[PDB]
From Swiss-Prot:
Associates with the 26S proteasome; this association occurs upon exposure to arsenite and is reduced in the presence of ATP. Interacts (via AN1-type 1 and 2 zinc fingers) with PSMD1; this interaction is increased upon arsenite treatment and occurs in an ATP-independent manner. Interacts with PSMC4. Interacts with PSMA1. Interacts (via its ubiquitin-like region) with VCP; this interaction occurs in an arsenite-dependent manner and is necessary for the recruitment of the ubiquitin-selective ATPase VCP to stress granules (SGs). Plays a role in the regulation of cytoplasmic stress granules (SGs) turnover. SGs are dynamic and transient cytoplasmic ribonucleoprotein assemblies important for cellular protein homeostasis when protein production is suspended after acute exogenous stress. Associates with SGs and is involved in the efficient and specific arsenite-induced clearance process of SGs through the recruitment of the ubiquitin-selective ATPase VCP and the 26S proteasome. This is AN1-type zinc finger protein 1. It is found in: Cytoplasm, Stress granule. The keyword Repeat applies. Its main location: cytoplasm. Residues 31-131 are annotated as: ubiquitin-like. The keyword Repeat applies. The chain holds residues 133 to 268 of 268 of the full protein. One of its GO terms (biological process) is positive regulation of intracellular protein transport.
Amino acid sequence: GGSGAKNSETAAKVALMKLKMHADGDKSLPQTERIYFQVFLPKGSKEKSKPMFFCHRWSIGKAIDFAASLARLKNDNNKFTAKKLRLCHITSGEALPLDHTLETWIAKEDCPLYNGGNIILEYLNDEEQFCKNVESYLE
């Protein structure tokens, strides 16, 4: 990278390395529009949490397909009549719209979200849209 401002900018930089320090990646990444989020494991392995950042600001359809990969689970997002791991909103349960874009949600006035937020990963049919009890989402 390369930039100098301090005072305010430092607030974002210090916060970036803070999370990235635990996540899987170098604090100094090329993607300037990259995004960071905590991937809450489905709770069923040796690890409890699995942080990771990526410029998945694109369509949500790609996020899901990617989640299955990062989570090291089975998937395909094409020809499968089973349950797939999707990305839901934190403290909400609302499953991200696969037929929409992530940026749209960030610019949304009703839900002005941005990088640095939390995300949940659970096996939910593509037909789904909103999940209940974010805590018992996996039960």
